[PDB]
Each structure stands twice: as structure tokens, then as C-alpha cells.
Design a protein around this motif. Structure first.
Motif, PDB file in Angstrom:
ATOM      1  N   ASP A  25     -13.400 -87.182  15.297  1.00 16.38           N
ATOM      2  CA  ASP A  25     -12.384 -86.133  15.413  1.00 16.38           C
ATOM      3  C   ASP A  25     -11.973 -85.570  14.046  1.00 16.38           C
ATOM      4  OD1 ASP A  25      -9.709 -88.439  16.374  1.00 16.38           O
ATOM      5  OD2 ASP A  25     -10.415 -87.860  14.381  1.00 16.38           O
ATOM      6  N   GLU A  26     -11.165 -84.512  14.052  1.00 22.37           N
ATOM      7  CA  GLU A  26     -10.853 -83.785  12.820  1.00 22.37           C
ATOM      8  C   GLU A  26     -10.236 -84.722  11.795  1.00 22.37           C
ATOM      9  OE1 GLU A  26      -8.447 -80.180  13.271  1.00 22.37           O
ATOM     10  OE2 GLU A  26      -9.651 -79.304  11.689  1.00 22.37           O
ATOM     11  N   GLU A  30     -11.564 -85.512   7.932  1.00 24.31           N
ATOM     12  CA  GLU A  30     -10.645 -85.300   6.812  1.00 24.31           C
ATOM     13  C   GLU A  30     -10.378 -86.610   6.065  1.00 24.31           C
ATOM     14  OE1 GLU A  30      -7.670 -83.141   9.254  1.00 24.31           O
ATOM     15  OE2 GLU A  30      -8.007 -81.385   7.988  1.00 24.31           O
ATOM     16  N   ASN A  31     -10.186 -87.710   6.796  1.00 21.86           N
ATOM     17  CA  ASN A  31     -10.092 -89.042   6.195  1.00 21.86           C
ATOM     18  C   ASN A  31     -11.305 -89.435   5.370  1.00 21.86           C
ATOM     19  OD1 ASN A  31      -7.939 -90.571   8.544  1.00 21.86           O
ATOM     20  ND2 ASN A  31      -7.834 -90.866   6.312  1.00 21.86           N
ATOM     21  N   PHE A  32     -12.487 -89.116   5.877  1.00 17.78           N
ATOM     22  CA  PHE A  32     -13.723 -89.383   5.156  1.00 17.78           C
ATOM     23  C   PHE A  32     -13.738 -88.583   3.857  1.00 17.78           C
ATOM     24  CE2 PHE A  32     -18.397 -88.828   4.507  1.00 17.78           C
ATOM     25  CZ  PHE A  32     -18.719 -90.172   4.350  1.00 17.78           C
ATOM     26  N   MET A  33     -13.406 -87.295   3.942  1.00 17.38           N
ATOM     27  CA  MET A  33     -13.255 -86.432   2.767  1.00 17.38           C
ATOM     28  C   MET A  33     -12.365 -87.099   1.723  1.00 17.38           C
ATOM     29  SD  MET A  33     -13.210 -82.441   2.630  1.00 17.38           S
ATOM     30  CE  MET A  33     -13.488 -82.961   0.938  1.00 17.38           C
ATOM     31  N   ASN A 291     -20.103 -99.488  25.775  1.00 18.46           N
ATOM     32  CA  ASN A 291     -19.869 -98.431  24.790  1.00 18.46           C
ATOM     33  C   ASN A 291     -18.575 -98.682  24.035  1.00 18.46           C
ATOM     34  OD1 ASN A 291     -18.279 -95.484  24.369  1.00 18.46           O
ATOM     35  ND2 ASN A 291     -20.376 -95.561  23.608  1.00 18.46           N
ATOM     36  N   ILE A 292     -18.687 -98.669  22.711  1.00 18.41           N
ATOM     37  CA  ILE A 292     -17.541 -98.773  21.808  1.00 18.41           C
ATOM     38  C   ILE A 292     -17.542 -97.613  20.818  1.00 18.41           C
ATOM     39  CG2 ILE A 292     -16.286-100.210  20.171  1.00 18.41           C
ATOM     40  CD1 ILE A 292     -16.675-101.671  22.863  1.00 18.41           C
ATOM     41  N   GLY A 293     -16.509 -96.773  20.891  1.00 18.02           N
ATOM     42  CA  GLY A 293     -16.449 -95.577  20.041  1.00 18.02           C
ATOM     43  C   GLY A 293     -15.424 -95.769  18.939  1.00 18.02           C
ATOM     44  N   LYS A 298     -13.072 -95.374  13.897  1.00 17.63           N
ATOM     45  CA  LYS A 298     -11.763 -95.198  13.264  1.00 17.63           C
ATOM     46  C   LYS A 298     -11.363 -96.427  12.447  1.00 17.63           C
ATOM     47  CE  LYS A 298      -9.769 -91.637  16.098  1.00 17.63           C
ATOM     48  NZ  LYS A 298      -9.413 -90.713  14.971  1.00 17.63           N
ATOM     49  N   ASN A 299     -12.324 -97.329  12.259  1.00 17.36           N
ATOM     50  CA  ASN A 299     -12.120 -98.570  11.509  1.00 17.36           C
ATOM     51  C   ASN A 299     -12.557 -98.311  10.078  1.00 17.36           C
ATOM     52  OD1 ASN A 299     -12.937-101.278  10.304  1.00 17.36           O
ATOM     53  ND2 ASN A 299     -12.106-102.007  12.255  1.00 17.36           N
ATOM     54  N   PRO A 300     -11.733 -98.737   9.095  1.00 16.12           N
ATOM     55  CA  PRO A 300     -12.027 -98.583   7.669  1.00 16.12           C
ATOM     56  C   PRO A 300     -13.400 -99.118   7.274  1.00 16.12           C
ATOM     57  CG  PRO A 300      -9.773 -99.292   7.953  1.00 16.12           C
ATOM     58  CD  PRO A 300     -10.438 -99.411   9.305  1.00 16.12           C
ATOM     59  N   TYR A 301     -13.834-100.207   7.906  1.00 20.86           N
ATOM     60  CA  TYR A 301     -15.187-100.724   7.700  1.00 20.86           C
ATOM     61  C   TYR A 301     -15.899-100.842   9.040  1.00 20.86           C
ATOM     62  CZ  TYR A 301     -13.264-101.462   3.118  1.00 20.86           C
ATOM     63  OH  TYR A 301     -12.661-101.269   1.896  1.00 20.86           O
ATOM     64  N   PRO A 302     -16.600 -99.761   9.437  1.00 22.54           N
ATOM     65  CA  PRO A 302     -17.305 -99.727  10.713  1.00 22.54           C
ATOM     66  C   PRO A 302     -18.403-100.779  10.841  1.00 22.54           C
ATOM     67  CG  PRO A 302     -17.869 -97.800   9.377  1.00 22.54           C
ATOM     68  CD  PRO A 302     -16.707 -98.476   8.720  1.00 22.54           C
ATOM     69  N   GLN A 303     -19.119-101.108   9.761  1.00 19.68           N
ATOM     70  CA  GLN A 303     -20.111-102.192   9.818  1.00 19.68           C
ATOM     71  C   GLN A 303     -19.515-103.504  10.349  1.00 19.68           C
ATOM     72  OE1 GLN A 303     -23.200-104.609   7.041  1.00 19.68           O
ATOM     73  NE2 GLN A 303     -23.095-102.431   6.463  1.00 19.68           N
ATOM     74  N   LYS A 304     -18.352-103.878   9.831  1.00 20.68           N
ATOM     75  CA  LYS A 304     -17.712-105.130  10.228  1.00 20.68           C
ATOM     76  C   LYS A 304     -17.252-105.061  11.679  1.00 20.68           C
ATOM     77  CE  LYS A 304     -16.129-105.241   5.534  1.00 20.68           C
ATOM     78  NZ  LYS A 304     -15.032-104.745   4.667  1.00 20.68           N
TER      79      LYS A 304
END
Ligand code: NUP
Ligand code: NUP
Lengths: 321, 330
Positions: A25-26, A30-33, A291-293, A298-304
Motif C-alpha cells: 500500500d501507499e 513511502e516507508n520504503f522510500m 497466504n500471509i500478506g 508490513k514487518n520491518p524485517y520481512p525475511q524474519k
């Protein structure tokens, strides 16, 4: 060959049924930016070292530029660049734990054309990595019209599968899962029991001869699969059954023992992982995609986040084995 | 006492246009690959007569996407801009249909499926089409049959009502009616929007769930219709000059009659005339309301695949209006 074979072979290589949902989502973009500024564009720098970034279709030249250069010299492309790079980051970080990725079309359309370019690049990237894909678009229309979605999803994106709402009827599947002219067959999951709080209103409260609508709908979908000889061609029609819908999951798995189920609703929607996987369990566990989205993306470390869902799924799969 | 363009609810916008042009024709704009290719060829054969007329229209200067390309001379496109050729001829095909037919249209309905199969290029066209219709002030419907959970479906609301600035859209409420809170209402801006929910469709097997499923001797399509209206009430849509209406196929005479009988003042959108062969006299009679805009009759390919769409449109306008007259004169 078919999606049935692709799923089986991938299950053999990675031993899980985690489906990672990629629904940016937006706020996420923006958080990634923002994070990437704070971090010297570390994640983007990683993205650029990966080999398959060189095989995406749309504006590759832009994607390969240094962030500092995009921001100054290609400003109009900044949203495109960071959106695409967000998706590449999630995929690169989590694909090792994923049996399949599901992208919900709704997240790629609201900015107009720009998100569709991103979505195409996302599907190109996953195709190149040979990771099974699902476009979640819940398509429905008359036959002449729906053929355009068949083209978009199966020819343009080269998705392995999509979601379909068959409330209008099952004949639409003939023009989604089958291309007579080209002799091509495609897979789909039809909506059976969804996760929204008021899902009972039609899926449970309507019936036909002592059976709730969701059962009628599941049965008619498999009847259409039969008429089409999908499984004969290594493709299938399966069911979307909510991960918070234990009774229905239990019923569907009991009465349709070898069906393929896609189950969203764990994480952000408080569904229950142990109960869902236990009730929908099949020894060929590509038949119960969990399915897990948002709980990953939205997790700071998606790998973990991915790793923990993978490990928990696998510990539950062993319990049931 | 006057409201400016864009500053009124859909109910008011429809009623005003109905008063102006006295029809319920809804023109469907569903261009397929053959339509775009055939337009390109025909224009090439005739020194781009229709594109040059498009370029004369004041409002082409007001659309959002790639005007630099859209406003180029057609021979320059073919020679100097070959990568933009499809975009240009697709967009000009839609502008040409709109220009030739809009004077007869109560509303235009664009089916999203036709604008997506080439990727992003068709969504640019679709954006320009909606910006253009907005400039002309012609009521719009995006036919997308959207459905999802609340958090997801909001994204469709943003696309349809903020990005395209559509007046309405079609929605499939099989998942439930809670989704309508996230489509017909934006809590953040306190804005209300209109939609048509699927009730009885034109596909040959539409009975399989819409009629076969029931609750207490009421068929699914009746239950779905009632539930939609219940949500419309809850949301106070009609107090905000918006509505939730019903898609009822032009071939579904008995269902149309039941719906108009049981929900006398509902808004109905009825596709299936023309290419799909539905009976126009039967449909319009069964669906009739003295406020014409409550029985939109959609006609697509019968107009857009005709070599002379202005005349095709005029002929359906006149046929419809004749049936309206008969229903009005009793
Ligand atoms: N197709 C769906 C049917 C459903 O019942 N619930 C649901 O959440 N989905 C989709 O699955 C995903 C769940 O994502 P999350 O809740 O894990 O973020 C989203 O794309 C939803 O729109
Ligand atoms: N929304 C619809 C519901 C339906 O039941 N039948 C139908 O044809 N439609 C749409 O109306 C239009 C009919 O166009 P035509 O048959 O006049 O070309 C197409 O966009 C269809 O997808």
C-alpha cells in the motif's frame, strides 16, 4: 507443464505451503522510500546485485539507476522506481520460504498505469525465478468480456493462476481456464468462504436442498473443472476458504478430499494458523496454501517474518504427518 | 440556485441530463483489439479524417496523460513515434466514439476488462477517456464488478472515484454488503459514491446461483437486492444524492418485473440489448419508471462496431424514446 506439476515440484524443493501475499500500500512504499534514505539505500543496492533484475520488461534502464540519480534526474520516475524496488526487496528477502506468491491486483491499480507497469515487472521477476504465482483479482464477467482478463492474466502477466468470483455462474470459467484456439489450460481458485465479518450473509444463509451456498458453489466449480478436463491437463479449479473459517475448511477438506485450497486471513486478520492448517491439511500440502500478506510485508524485517511462518507451518505439517 | 459541473451528487447529475435529452440510453464503450486495429486501418485509408476531427475538440487539451503524443499529427505518430502508435489509435478510437455519439447518451459505461489486457497502455487510455467525459459532463459508469475485503477494496474506490473521477461503478456483493462501506463511502473525506450491484446477469447460466439459491422461498437475487438497499439506507446515500442500484439483464424479463414491482423506485442498469439480442420493448416496459434514468439501457457493440456509430446511436436513441413514449402514454 501444468500448475499442478509446478506446485508439486516446488513443494519438493522447499517443503512448505507458505503463500506470500505481495499487496504493497501507499504507506509501505513511502516507508520504503524513507527507510532507504536512513540506510544509504542498502536494500536497493542489494536489489541491483541480483541477476534477474536484468530480465524485467518495463523501464529496466530506470530500475538499474542509482537512487541518488533517480531522485535528481528522473524525478517523475521516483514513485515507479521505489514501488518496483519495494516489491523486488520483499521477493528477494522471502522467496526462499515461499511455495507461491499472490499479488492482489487492487494494490497495483489505484495510481493508474504506473502500478500496472510495476505489476508486470513483478510477474516477470517471479517467472524468471520460476516461482508459482497467483493474481488475486476476483474476476467476473460474461464470456466475451472475461476473455480479456484471460489475456491479461495468462498471456500478458504469464501468471500461473488467478482468483475468480463465480456468483454470475460457472460458464465464465470456460473463457478463463481454457483457450480453445490455442489449446491452453489455466488454473483458478474460486471464492468459496471469505474472511470478511459478514461473509455468512450469502455464503452461508442462502442454500439449495439442505446445503449452504458455499458448498453448492464449490461443487459446481468442480463440475466445471470436470466438463473442461482441467486436471487431465495438469491444471485445476480450487477454492478460496478463509483461514478464520474452521467449520467450512473442515467441511470442504472432508467432502472434497483432493481439492486445492487457498487460505488467506492469518496475521492481519487474526485467523488461526494451527487450526486452519490442521482442518485443511492434505499430505500433498500444496493443496492447502496458507497466504500471509501484511504480517510479512508490513514487518520491518520481512525475511524474519517469512522464516517464522515457514518454521511454524513446517512444525505443524509434521504434527499432522 | 445553480450548481457547477462536478459539484453535485450522481442522482442530481442523472436527473438533469435526463431532463435535457429525454432518454435512458447508456452507451457502452468496450473497444476490443479488432476495433482498434480496424480504426487504425480505416483512418490510414482516409487521411485520418476522424482523428483530425478529434483534434479540433477543445477538451482534448484537458486530458491528463501524454497530451504531447495525443495531439501530434497522425502521420508523425506512424513515422516518428511507432512505440506510441497503439496508445494513440486506441485513445483516438474512444474519443471518436464519444464525439460521434455523446449527444444521445444519458451515460457512458466503460468495462474495465477492455482496457487492461495490454498492460499499462490501456489504463492511460481509460484515464484520458474518463477525464474527457468529465470535461463534457456526461455521467459515467466504470463496469469492473469489483469485490474484496474492506481494506483491499478501498484501493478500487480510490482508483474509480478519485483517479478516474467516475460517477459510479458496478460491484459484486456475493462476499457481503460490508464492502459497500468501503466503496460507496470514504470515511476520511466524508464523501459518498454511487454503485450498481449485480442482481440478475445476462450470461446463459446466470440462474445457477442467482435463482437456484434461496432463503425462505426468496431467490438469491431478491435477497441480494434487498440487502444492498438496506446498506444504502444505513449509509444515508440518497440523502447525499447518491444511490445503490441494480444490474438486471435485458433478457431477464420476469426478474426485471419482480424488481421494479417490489422496489418501485430503484435504479436499474440493464445490459444485453444489441449484440446479446435481448428484447428492448419487453425490457424497457418491465423496467419502466417515469424517471427514465432509473432504467438505463446499455448498448455497446451494436453502436461501437457499426461503421457509422453516430447514426447507430441515433437509431437506438429514437427506438428507446419511442418505447418510452408508449409507456408514458399509458
Ligand atoms: N482473496 C481474499 C479472500 C478473503 O476472504 N480474504 C482475503 O483476505 N483475501 C485476500 O487475501 C489477502 C490477505 O492479505 P493479508 O490479510 O494477509 O494482508 C488480501 O489480498 C485479500 O484481499
Ligand atoms: N455488466 C454486465 C452484466 C451482464 O450481466 N451482462 C453484460 O453484458 N454486462 C456488461 O455490459 C456490456 C454489454 O455490452 P454489449 O453486449 O452491448 O456489447 C459489457 O461490458 C458486459 O460485460
Amino acid at each position: 507443464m501444468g500448475f499442478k506439476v509446478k506446485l508439486e515440484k516446488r513443494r519438493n524443493a522447499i517443503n512448505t505451503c507458505l503463500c506470500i501475499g505481495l499487496d504493497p500500500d501507499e504507506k509501505d512504499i513511502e516507508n520504503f522510500m524513507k527507510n532507504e534514505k536512513e540506510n544509504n539505500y542498502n536494500n536497493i543496492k542489494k536489489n541491483l546485485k541480483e541477476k534477474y533484475i536484468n530480465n524485467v520488461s518495463i523501464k529496466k534502464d530506470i530500475l538499474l539507476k542509482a537512487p541518488d540519480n533517480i531522485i535528481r534526474e528522473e524525478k517523475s520516475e521516483e514513485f515507479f522506481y521505489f514501488f518496483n524496488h519495494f516489491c523486488f526487496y520483499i521477493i528477494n528477502e522471502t522467496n526462499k520460504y515461499a511455495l507461491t506468491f499472490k499479488m492482489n491486483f487492487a494494490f497495483y491499480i489505484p495510481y493508474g498505469s504506473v502500478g500496472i507497469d510495476v505489476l508486470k515487472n513483478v510477474f516477470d521477476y517471479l517467472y524468471e525465478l520460476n516461482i508459482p504465482t497467483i493474481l488475486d483479482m476476483k474476476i467476473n464477467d460474461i464470456g466475451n468480456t472475461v476473455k480479456n482478463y484471460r489475456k491479461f492474466i495468462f498471456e500478458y502477466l504469464k501468471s500461473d493462476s488467478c482468483t475468480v468470483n463465480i456468483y454470475m455462474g460457472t460458464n465464465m470459467l470456460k473463457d478463463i481456464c481454457y483457450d480453445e484456439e490455442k489449446n491452453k489450460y489455466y488454473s483458478a481458485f474460486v471464492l468459496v468462504k471469505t474472511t470478511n465479518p459478514d461473509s455468512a450473509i450469502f455464503q452461508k444463509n442462502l442454500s439449495l436442498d439442505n446445503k449452504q451456498a458455499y458448498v453448492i458453489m464449490a461443487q459446481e466449480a468442480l463440475n466445471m473443472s470436470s466438463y473442461l478436463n482441467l486436471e487431465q491437463n495438469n491444471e485445476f479449479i480450487g477454492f478460496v476458504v478463509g483461514a478464520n473459517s474452521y467449520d467450512e475448511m473442515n467441511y470442504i477438506r472432508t467432502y472434497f478430499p483432493n481439492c486445492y485450497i487457498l487460505s488467506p486471513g492469518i496475521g492481519a486478520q487474526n485467523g488461526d494458523l494451527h487450526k486452519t492448517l490442521t482442518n485443511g491439511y492434505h499430505k500433498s500440502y500444496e493443496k492447502i496454501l496458507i497466504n500471509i500478506g501484511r504480517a510479512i510485508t508490513k514487518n520491518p524485517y520481512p525475511q524474519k517474518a517469512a522464516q517464522m511462518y515457514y518454521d511454524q507451518i513446517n512444525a505443524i505439517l509434521k504434527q499432522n504427518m
